Amino acid sequence: QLLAEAAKHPDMLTSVRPNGLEDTPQFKIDIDQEKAQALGVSINDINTTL
Amino acid sequence: LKVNQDGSRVLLRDVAKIELGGENYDIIAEFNGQPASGLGIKLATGANAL
């Protein structure tokens, strides 16, 4: 919103840019503990393996 | 916390109350009768108070 409002005053502000990085894709893993316990698997071992 | 042989699964809700509370209820403050909080500040050796 601020970048938009700043692009409307090109007579005082120029090259208004963020130095950071824009969000990107991430691979989520929603592990389930019910099944992991029904199969007798130590979540700690799961995480260590991963 | 545990998955029973009959298939019933036990959570924390069933064996423990869970809330947001202070990590130490030892200290309490009161400003002219009503509840309050605050910060007592202690200066460093070799600094100016004002």
Side-chain angles (χ1 to χ4, degrees):
Chain A
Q1 163 173 355
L2 178 88
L3 303 197
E5 260 179 339
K8 300 179 171 152
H9 308 251
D11 47 293
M12 315 177 67
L13 308 164
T14 186
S15 180
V16 163
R17 56 201 166 85
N19 208 37
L21 283 171
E22 295 289 330
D23 296 347
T24 81
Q26 275 144 18
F27 186 69
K28 183 74 186 294
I29 303 192
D30 316 284
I31 282 165
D32 191 315
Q33 300 90 2
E34 306 207 20
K35 193 74 190 293
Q37 289 179 19
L39 301 156
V41 180
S42 60
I43 204 157
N44 286 286
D45 190 357
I46 285 161
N47 294 333
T48 287
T49 299
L50 193 67
Chain B
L1 301 160
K2 193 170 63 170
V3 74
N4 288 342
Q5 77 285 17
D6 51 6
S8 86
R9 60 190 181 288
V10 286
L11 317 178
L12 266 187
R13 277 190 303 239
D14 293 0
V15 308
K17 283 176 189 175
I18 295 140
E19 84 181 15
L20 275 164
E23 47 193 56
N24 218 3
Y25 301 71
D26 288 325
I27 309 193
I28 315 189
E30 190 184 10
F31 176 85
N32 291 2
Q34 52 169 310
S37 183
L39 299 170
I41 285 145
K42 280 177 160 163
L43 196 84
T45 48
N48 212 43
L50 307 176

